[PDB]
Paper text:
The TsBGL crystal belonged to the space group P1211 and diffracted to a resolution of 2.14Å. The asymmetric unit of the crystal structure consisted of two protein molecules. The overall view indicates that TsBGL has a classic (β/α)8-barrel domain structure. The central (β/α)8 barrels consisted of eight parallel β-strands, namely β1 (Phe8-Ser13), β2 (Asn77-Ile83), β3 (Lys146-Asn152), β4 (Asp203-Asn209), β5 (Tyr271-Ile278), β6 (Trp335-Tyr340), β7 (Pro409-Glu414), and β8 (Asn445-His451), surrounded by eight α-helices, namely, α1 (Asn59-Ile74), α2 (Asn126-Arg143), α3 (Lys181-Gly199), α4 (Asn232-Asp258), α5 (Arg287-Asn302), α6 (Pro393-Glu405), α7 (Ile424-Lys444), and α8 (Arg483-Lys496). In TsBGL, Glu210 and Glu414 served as the putative catalytic residues. Glu414 was located at the end of β-strand 7, Glu210 was located behind Asn209, which was the end of β-strand 4, Glu210 is a proton donor, Glu414 is a catalytic nucleophile, and the closest distance between Glu210 and Glu414 was 4.5Å, which matched the catalytic characteristics of GH1 BGLs. The active center of TsBGL was surrounded by aromatic groups and polar residues, including Gln17, His153, Phe154, Asn209, Glu210, Asn339, Tyr341, Glu414, Trp452, Glu459, Trp460, and Phe468. The substitution of either Glu210 or Glu414 with alanine significantly decreased the enzymatic activity. Moreover, TsBGL has approximately 37% of its charged residues involved in ion-pairs, whereas for BGPh, BGTa, and BGSs, 35.2, 41, and 43.2% of its charged residues form ion pairs, respectively. TsBGL exhibited high thermostability, after incubating TsBGL at 85°C for 1.5h, 84% of the activity was retained, and at 90°C, TsBGL retained 47% of its activity for 1.5h.
Author numbering:
A (entry chain A): 1 to 351, 359 to 509
B (entry chain B): 2 to 351, 360 to 511
Write the structure that this text describes.
């Protein structure tokens, strides 16, 4: 019943949301699509982005040793960080020539990064950024935290994706990001170089964080405020295929250039997974329309990418009307990272059918209010639905890979829901681990407040409050709730009594 | 007796009346006040009541039966508020507009032209516009002269984040009336509403109690208003900006409302302002008490009328400066007078006011004042003679007067009948001797959400049951019916309702 002794307890972070913020300004990375996106005049006036700027952030780039000690002090034994591609290669790697292999239908089944390609990439990489990430990773290991390294977390180098150019011309001029197959080739070089660089201190790799968010938000949901903020159906399907293609070739390249077991316990020297945000879809009724909309949305967001990278089954229509198998894409995943925040309740609409989305549940509730199921609601308007964690893991379990909960958290700047959020969700997780025994860790989002993308700093996810002026960390009560659960390896009934539904 | 076309009616606001729908499809979460009353810190510290506007009386869906109720008791006029946040839930800052700036920094022109209206129409929530159009049309169908208030305290969250302002002491926003851009955006909103509603609306009100917004916002935190700061610098700036916003809105309403909905209206756009006038009684005839009463009367009652009637600007708010802008003179067609009670004060040397307890707004709720008068549930002294004194202060500026608010928090309805009879016989005497008051709007028709106090303060002539939303008229609604329908206070009624012995 208690969580197994080796169960991972930690937090997740990303480069763009954490790193910048130093007082002297020396650590600013202006060379991402997201950096240019949040500084865009038009985006700011329109309310597409918050107007907050990442360069005023919490300064994880220089303060990482303090945050790591904070994480250890509350019983964390694991931690995920993101590497900013734009930091390693501020200037294009397009001139390193590299052998490639193409499937009949056009997919890249192989990017031949050899010794000479590594040498040329070593001459283009920012040695300063590499050594800092090494110092970051080594500080985790020194404090006894197992390191998870994510290679891409939304942001792309500006020479890979200029979102203002893509938006203004509707993808006539670029660089076009994941719409362009060239991005697959460069991401493959970047992945190979990082595995060669850090393979001796990293065993748990992640290629992409929420790749389906990058594509949906970038090309089919402009309301969410992501670059390039278009609604182009063919560009959405192309980016999905390309980013899924990129994972496969990076998976093989990481396996080639990471042959060192940093930890003797690691299941292999290069244990490569993907972080995927799973949303349990709940049909509003058992009517045809509602059931058909739920099935379709579950297929596109939850299942489509996993059929690609685990089964090798490609559906270029994104709606389940086509199946094309590439044997070389089969079983290209070692473990799966499950991000869960809340569910979606949907209706089906006659059009063929299209999701409607019912309000009062899931992602569409009254901020600070109560959902129609009697659950508290975050500052983001998100329903606290702890049972959905079990639903999300059941969907993930279909693909037969070991699971880790890589993100789970709440926007709550005053911390009056987060303790119950931790107690209720970890109760569900504890029973799930004993029952199904295929989940091996819990990574909370996050240790500290950070820059919540298009929402800026006004969404506070941290177990620790951060004063943006002084960069001072002030742990919240929920950090103690986390400490108790992680240290005692169980959810004590005391915590269940003390933190009921607020 | 009152003249034949004397206005008998009531006033209301969007935030205090609209929400309540059980589903509830009408929830407007995008105001500073919505986030303000849902704030757990405010609720925990007693800043706000803990009651939520989503559980209110649902005037948004039930307006037809409330208007029939109003006409049922002899009303011929009704003031409603438009929620800016409902019309423009997303920022309008990218709708570019030419502006003119006085050398002292005041915005003298906001060039809302036809192109600006078209772009604003692309952003407006057409569902909200049509509902307000329905509410106004239903009022006309019952012989109720419509008064439309453009702003009644609440602001869009993209205009004012009161938590960010409070937490950061105005270092992070958006900052509402502290920021001059609010004037520009309010000007665009006023121009759009005149364009869209001008053929059905002739009596316009820019702001309801603007000095209450700034005073309670930036110099009186115990009132419980957002952002709950005390900051005289911000108090001055907000006073100047909201007065600036009235003048430009006045000019743009008259530009885009060229249609006389009623052929006997004074003009196509009769633009007024609703100002709460507090008769200030010095405690004694000493210099200290007289100097403090003069200052208090100047800052609260007179300062903003010096701004928008005479175009005289006082940057200090204490009578130390004098700046004339001819572009600002006579920017007012009529003056709505809100009167609730007086203030008795002393002067203390620091000369600032020292409010004498037992009179006016500072009595023990449900008790007796030191002048022997009944006291509302709010702790407000019932002082009907102050109505004549408040209209005297109003009369100095040479504009037609309408009593736009007058009422009492009295859930048991044991004082309201005397309150009604006594205030209105004072008003009747004033009307025949001064002949410059043309209406009486009671606050309010039904119980509503009384801001920081929630539903505890019941001002309605009609009680409301929040479980079923059922309206239950009080005895005092019959008193109002008799007085309004007979166009005089029958001496029978003065006998029935004398000043109670407690
Ligand atoms: Mg390794
Ligand atoms: Mg008109």
């Amino acid at each position: 019943m208690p969580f197994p002794e080796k169960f991972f307890w930690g937090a997740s972070s990303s480069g763009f949301q954490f790193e910048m913020g130093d007082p002297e300004g020396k650590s600013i990375d202006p060379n991402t699509d997201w950096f240019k996106w949040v500084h865009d005049e038009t985006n700011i006036r329109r309310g597409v982005v918050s107007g907050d700027l990442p360069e005023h952030g919490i300064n994880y780039w220089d303060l990482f040793r303090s945050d790591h000690e904070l994480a250890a002090s509350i019983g964390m034994n694991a931690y995920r960080i993101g590497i900013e591609w734009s930091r390693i290669f501020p200037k294009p790697t397009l001139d390193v020539r590299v052998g490639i292999e193409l499937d009949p239908e056009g997919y890249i089944t192989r990017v031949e990064v050899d010794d000479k390609a590594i040498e040329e990439l070593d001459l283009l990489a920012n040695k300063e950024a590499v050594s800092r990430y090494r110092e970051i990773i080594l500080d985790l290991r020194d404090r006894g935290l197992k390191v998870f390294v994510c290679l891409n977390h939304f942001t792309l180098p500006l020479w890979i994706h200029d979102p203002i150019a893509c938006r203004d011309t509707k993808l006539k001029r670029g660089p076009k990001g994941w719409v362009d197959k060239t991005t697959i080739l460069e991401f493959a070089k970047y992945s190979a170089y990082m595995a060669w660089s850090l393979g001796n201190i990293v065993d748990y790799w992640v290629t992409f964080n929420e790749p389906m968010v990058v594509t949906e938000a970038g090309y089919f949901q402009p309301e969410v405020g992501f670059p390039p903020g278009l609604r182009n159906i063919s560009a959405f399907k192309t980016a999905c295929l390309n980013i899924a293609n990129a994972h496969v070739v990076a998976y093989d390249l990481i396996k080639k250039y990471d042959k060192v077991r940093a930890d003797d316990d690691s299941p292999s020297a290069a244990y490569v997974g993907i972080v995927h945000n799973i949303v349990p879809i709940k049909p509003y009724s058992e009517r045809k329309l509602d059931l058909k909309a739920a099935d379709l949305m579950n297929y596109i967001h939850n299942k489509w990418i996993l059929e690609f990278i685990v089964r090798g089954k490609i559906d270029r229509s994104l709606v389940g009307r086509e199946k094309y198998l590439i044997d070389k894409f089969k079983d290209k995943l070692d473990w799966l990272g499950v991000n869960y925040y809340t569910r979606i309740v949907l209706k089906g609409k006659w059009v063929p059918v299209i999701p409607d989305i019912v309000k009062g549940y899931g992602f569409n509730c009254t901020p600070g209010g109560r959902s129609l199921d009697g659950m508290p609601v975050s500052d983001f308007g998100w329903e606290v639905y702890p049972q959905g964690l079990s639903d999300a893991l059941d969907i993930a379990s279909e693909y037969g890979k070991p699971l880790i909960v890589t993100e789970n958290g709440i926007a709550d700047s005053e911390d009056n829901i987060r303790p119950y959020f931790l107690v209720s969700h970890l109760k569900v997780l504890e029973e799930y681990v004993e029952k199904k025994k295929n989940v091996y860790g819990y990574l909370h989002w996050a240790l500290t407040d950070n820059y919540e993308w298009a929402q800026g700093f006004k969404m506070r996810f941290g177990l620790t409050d951060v004063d943006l002026e002084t960069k001072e960390r002030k742990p919240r009560e929920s950090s103690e709730v986390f400490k108790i659960i992680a240290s005692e390896k169980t959810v004590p009934e005391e915590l269940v009594e003390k933190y009921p539904k607020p």
